[PDB]
Amino acid sequence: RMKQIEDKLEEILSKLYHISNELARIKKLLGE
Amino acid sequence: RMKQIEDKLEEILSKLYHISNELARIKKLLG
Amino acid sequence: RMKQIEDKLEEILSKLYHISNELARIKKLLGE
Amino acid sequence: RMKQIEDKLEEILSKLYHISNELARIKKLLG
């Protein structure tokens, strides 16, 4: 219930870390 | 190549909509 | 407390809507 | 102009780090 929310948050933080890495590779590529 | 960046922006925008949906589900579960 | 979390979520959803709009304008601009 | 897109990617990445920090604070507040 509440722990199910905490687990979903940790999943959502992992998904936003992969998005910030891929946004950083796209900024890199645009910068070349 | 620029096409490859535009496609990865489209995949990011679709993953951003999935997370906003998940966090709206959680904000519902909290009210 | 719990309502403070619900309010922060609504703030974070508004911030991710402005990021998805600006990512969409950047995709538009790259597409021209 | 491409410089303007790279700067707005940098502002998005800095706003993405602020949201992940906020959602880590909330996941702390829930444990």
DSSP A1-32: -HHHHHHHHHHHHHHHHHHHHHHHHHHHHHH-
Under 8 Å CB-to-CB from A22, ≥6 apart: which residues?
A: B8, B12
* Six-digit token string for D24: 């880590």
Residues B26, B12: Cα–Cα separation, whole Å:
21
Out of B1, B12, B29, the one facing A23 most closely (by C-beta) is B12
| Mutate: best of A1, A16, A26, A27, partner B, most B CBs <10 A | A26
Contacts of B13 in chain C (CB under 8 A): 20, 23-24, 27
Residues A24, D13: Cα–Cα separation, whole Å:
8
* Angle, CA of C13, D22 and C7, to the nearest 5°: 50
C15 vs D15: CB contact, 8 Å cut-off? yes
**CB-defined contacts C:D, below 8 A:** 28
Locus of tokens 């998940």: B22
A16 closest CA partner among B24, D6, B8, B20: B20
* Six-digit token string for B26: 């959680």
C-beta atoms surrounding B3 within 10 Å: 9
| Mutate: best of C15, C25, C30, C32, partner D, most D CBs <10 A | C15
C-beta atoms surrounding A5 within 10 Å: 16
B8 closest CA partner among C32, A23, D14, A30: A23
D16 vs A23: CB contact, 8 Å cut-off? yes
